[PDB]
């Protein structure tokens, strides 16, 4: 009927935040929430493959990508399934998340339930970079905080 | 009100040596913490923010670490330029509060040393001028009576 999820971001540093996911019928996934303790500017925001938190955010593994594509922005056709682009922090160090996406899901083969959200140090270049790395990680840099995606009431 | 506490209150150290100041908050400040350096007779400068991020144009010998309530600034290889007072500030809760500071002293180049003297001397003279201006002030009031 209506699928709901939630994610609590946690890291060694100052980043904190709660992310909410709602999906009505087989409509898009509405991502929402707030992230604090960021530097002003843009920060890569991706669903990584595993909800394995045993070794911090490193154990989350690479971007969630079942179709073996290359990294891109959210509007690209050539993109990972997890690639949701960038969240934007103000001078108050806060980002309001607001994202709608169709490739991710809260059920079926493209379910993110049981996987990890990660917010990054730098801006995601959306795969438009002049190097190998861009089409893997988008040069978003290190992982400030992450959390496993759980089912919400 | 968060009490941020630094130690040592001062310290002395030889060139090349490795130094570690600490800063301890009376509660968890989740790495909302900045390190400022203030050289003699100079304006403060930002070294580190969010506990561990270097500011722009900061030598990499400077590093910051810690979490929860306990943080530290570490100069890896101490040059002579680094004699200064260092301050930690937390911005997790209002009001923003500051350590009492750790003072740190030692145990082309000739002309930079020469130019440093003029501001120092002019500052010391200006102290004297305002000192004597405050001594005139009462006497001049008495003259208009």
């Amino acid at each position, epitope marked *: 009927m209506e699928m709901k999820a939630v994610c609590v971001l946690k890291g060694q540093g*100052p980043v904190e935040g709660t992310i909410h996911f709602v999906q009505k019928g087989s409509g898009p996934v509405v991502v929402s929430g707030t992230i604090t*303790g960021l*530097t*002003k500017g843009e920060h890569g925001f991706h669903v990584h493959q595993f909800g394995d938190n045993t070794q911090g955010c490193t154990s989350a593994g690479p971007h969630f990508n079942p179709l073996s594509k290359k990294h891109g922005g959210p509007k690209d056709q050539e993109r990972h399934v997890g690639d949701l682009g960038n969240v934007t922090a103000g*001078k*108050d*160090g806060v980002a309001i998340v607001s994202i709608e996406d169709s490739l991710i899901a809260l059920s079926g083969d493209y379910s993110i339930i049981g996987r990890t959200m990660v917010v990054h140090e730098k801006r995601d270049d959306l795969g438009k970079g002049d190097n190998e790395e861009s089409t893997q990680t988008g040069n978003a840099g290190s992982r400030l905080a992450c959390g496993v995606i759980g089912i919400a009431q | 009100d968060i009490k941020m506490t630094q130690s040592p209150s001062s310290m002395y150290a030889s060139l090349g040596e490795r130094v570690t100041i600490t800063c301890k908050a009376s509660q968890d400040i989740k790495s*909302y913490l*900045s390190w*400022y350096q*203030q050289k003699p007779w100079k*304006s*403060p*400068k*930002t070294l580190i*923010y*969010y506990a561990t991020r270097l*500011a*722009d144009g900061v030598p990499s010998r400077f590093s910051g670490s810690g979490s929860g309530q306990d943080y530290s600034l570490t100069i890896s290889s101490l040059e002579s330029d680094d004699t200064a*007072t260092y*301050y930690c*500030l937390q*911005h997790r809760e*209002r*009001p*923003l*509060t*500051v*350590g*009492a*500071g750790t003072k740190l002293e030692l145990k082309e180049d000739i002309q930079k040393r020469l130019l440093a003297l003029d501001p120092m001397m002019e500052q010391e003279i*200006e102290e004297i001028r*305002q000192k004597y*201006q*405050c001594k005139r*002030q009462p006497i001049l009031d008495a003259i208009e009576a």
Partner: nanobody
Amino acid sequence: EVQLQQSGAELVRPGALVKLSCKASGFNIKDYYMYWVKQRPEQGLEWIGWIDPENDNTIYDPKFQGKASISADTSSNTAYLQLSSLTSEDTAVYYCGGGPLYAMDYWGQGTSVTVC
């Protein structure tokens, strides 16, 4: 290569009002917060307050709320600090700075105020 130009030295009678200024060049103060910081002689830094020039909202330390008054003119790209009912307690160097909420990117050279 940014600069904060602060007003010049002041020397005033007890009970005087004084208004310090901070003129920024190299950045739009609308994109930042403008902070003010006091340093009494032979002592450490006390943070007075900040203003968000984009909406003129000001936070203060309660210690100063009433004695000190912070304002910004976004047009002339200048920030202001106004100290009233001055005493010897107020003899200090006042630094203005600009930055996000989590860092001070830029510091002024400081304005000395002396009270007789």
